[PDB]
Amino acid sequence: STRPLTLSHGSLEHVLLVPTASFFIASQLQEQFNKILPEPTEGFAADDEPTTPAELVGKFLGYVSSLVEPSKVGQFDQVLNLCLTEFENCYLEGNDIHALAAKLLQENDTTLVKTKELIKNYITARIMAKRPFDKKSNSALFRAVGEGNAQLVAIF
Amino acid sequence: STRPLTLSHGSLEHVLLVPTASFFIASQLQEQFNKILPEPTEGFAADDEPTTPAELVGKFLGYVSSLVEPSKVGQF
Numbered sequence: 001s002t003r004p005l006t007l008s009h010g011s012l013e014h015v016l017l018v019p020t021a022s023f024f025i026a027s028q029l030q031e032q033f034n035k036i037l038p039e040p041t042e043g044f045a046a047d048d049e050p051t052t053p054a055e056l057v058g059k060f061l062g063y064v065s066s067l068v069e070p071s072k073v074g075q076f077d078q079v080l081n082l083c084l085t086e087f088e089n090c091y092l093e094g095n096d097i098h099a100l101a102a103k104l105l106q107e108n109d110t111t112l113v114k115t116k117e118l119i120k121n122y123i124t125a126r127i128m129a130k131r132p133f134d135k136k137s138n139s140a141l142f143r144a145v146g147e148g149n150a151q152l153v154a155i156f
Numbered sequence: 157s158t159r160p161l162t163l164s165h166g167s168l169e170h171v172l173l174v175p176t177a178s179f180f181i182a183s184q185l186q187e188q189f190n191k192i193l194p195e196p197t198e199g200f201a202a203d204d205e206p207t208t209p210a211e212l213v214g215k216f217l218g219y220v221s222s223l224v225e226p227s228k229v230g231q232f
Binding site: 024025031 | 159160162176179
């Protein structure tokens, strides 16, 4: 089957079931991460420390994407799309990353810099992962318009 | 291809691209080394601490050789 990979970051932790086909690559990327990251601080409420696992994996997406190249196919594209799925399943709920950011900002501790870095790296990867946004999602108001339930105008 | 193996010794560090054919053996030899070595000290300027990566790998050669036997062919 597969081997689990723990993304344990001091106060924080998230897991990722990695097929052993690339668990070695994932473990090496972890061997890079655990060094790249700073030390656990006040529950990871620091300048960049991921105060929750969602950003713990957001920074993960950021770096991994940093280690890829879309022009080519690599070994980290697999882990890229993989952790992409796992993140959009665990922390995201079919909604948009912006809703996730707004929530994590509202309920939990808030540092706008991180919560936006979240979308930053999420998107860099989600695209670098060859998963574009050529897929219109079910935005409530927009279908409400498609059905006439609403109506919009754009002011600049 | 291969997996990189970090020979990180506190202040010092050197890497070694190991073909996964024996990256397990290399990682186990590291699991021995990191214990055999003393702790990082004044930038590894101690009695035996490798003050640079060249000696960080010299001691590595020393031990690994200690773990071989020329009369036979081994995994190391």
